[PDB]
């Protein structure tokens, strides 16, 4: 099998309704105060292998 083809999703603050399909693979950034106090930092790629 794929060594890095299986991954999980690292996220929080948006607890999902049961049986919800999520495909928005967006790198987690806020661009506001609650990410190192600036925009572009804490831009963590949620998908982890």
């Amino acid at each position: 099998g794929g060594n890095y083809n299986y991954l999980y999703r690292l996220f929080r603050k948006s607890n999902l309704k049961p049986f919800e399909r999520d495909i928005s693979t967006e790198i987690y950034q806020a661009g506001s105060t609650p990410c190192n106090g600036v925009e572009g930092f804490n831009c963590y790629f949620p998908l982890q292998s």
Binding site: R12, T33, P34, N36, G37, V38
Partner: protein, 49 residues
């Protein structure tokens, strides 16, 4: 500060400490915490530190 082989341990108790005022500070190279969400540390009561 002391050396790595003779590190100093200091005791903190009976305090009202805010971590949000320090979380947003950018004077830190790295601040990652294990098993505890820093953002919610403002609403947690622990026995001692």
């Amino acid at each position: 500060f002391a050396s790595v082989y003779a590190w100093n341990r200091k005791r903190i108790s009976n305090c009202v400490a805010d971590y949000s005022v320090l979380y947003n500070s950018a004077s830190f190279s790295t601040f990652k915490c294990y098993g505890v969400s820093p953002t919610k540390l403002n609403d947690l009561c622990f026995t001692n530190v």
